[PDB]
Amino acid sequence: MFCSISGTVPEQGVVSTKSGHLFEKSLIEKYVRETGKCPVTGEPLSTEDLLPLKVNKTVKPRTAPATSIPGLLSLFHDEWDANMLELHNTRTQLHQTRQELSHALYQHDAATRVIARLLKERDEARAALAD
């Protein structure tokens, strides 16, 4: 239901026609003009191709304390707190996952070298037994 980039149910629901991916209106307009492409893949896209999927989302239910101007803004507060509290942790998870990937790549390179070497070992072993 959620805009792929957003992750929660769009309040201005829009799919692009060319893609198959439903998007946030303001966000995906910014993004189509921000790289020129479809952010799901990198496909080239234009801003009108957006299709206004609007079936009147108005279902977002007031919770118990959130039903309040003091409450709605306090949860606004901890909400932005949590949005950045997720983004920065994703920054460092990228860093450690990326580091792990680099280590794995180096290990893979070492493995390829060993396989290349051990293959010379076996090929010469067999050519020798042929004598």
Q: How many CA atoms lie within 13 A of 80 on its CB side?
A: 5
Q: Which of 17, 34, 37, 66 touches a copy of itself (CB under 8 A)? A: 34
Q: b or e along 55-87 (b: 16 or more beta carbons within 10 Å of the residue's beta carbon)?
A: eeeeeeeeeeeeeeeeeeeebeeeeeeeeeeee
Phi, psi of 91, deg, nearest 5: -60, -50
Residue type present at position 127: A
31 binds, among other proteins, a copy of itself, none (CB under 5 to 8 A by kind): a copy of itself
Per DSSP, what are the bridge partners of residue 23? 14
Q: How far is the CB of 8 from other proteins (least distance, A)?
A: 19
For tokens 């118990």, what's the residue? 64
What is the distance, to the nearest Å, from the Cα of residue 35 to the centroid of all Cα atoms in its chain?
Answer: 16
What is the distance, to the nearest Å, from the Cα of residue 41 to the centroid of all Cα atoms in its chain?
Answer: 10
Show the tokens assigned to 16: 């692009």
95 binds, among other proteins, a copy of itself, none (CB under 5 to 8 A by kind): other proteins
* Residue ranges in 84-123 that form contacts with a copy of itself under rule CB under 8 A: 84-88, 90-94, 97-98, 100-101, 104-105, 107-108, 111-112, 114-115, 118-119, 121-122
Residues 88-107, mask of contacts with other proteins (x by CB under 8 A):
xx-x-xxx--xx-xxx-xxx
Q: Which of 15, 30, 44, 56 touches a copy of itself (CB under 8 A)? A: 30
| Residue 72 binds other proteins (CB under 8 A) | yes
| Residue 120 binds other proteins (CB under 8 A) | no
What is the distance, to the nearest Å, from the Cα of residue 37 to the centroid of all Cα atoms in its chain?
Answer: 15
Q: Report the interface residues with a copy of itself, using CB under 8 A.
A: 5-6, 24, 26-27, 30-31, 34, 39, 64, 68-69, 72-73, 75-77, 79-88, 90-94, 97-98, 100-101, 104-105, 107-108, 111-112, 114-115, 118-119, 121-122, 125-126, 128-129
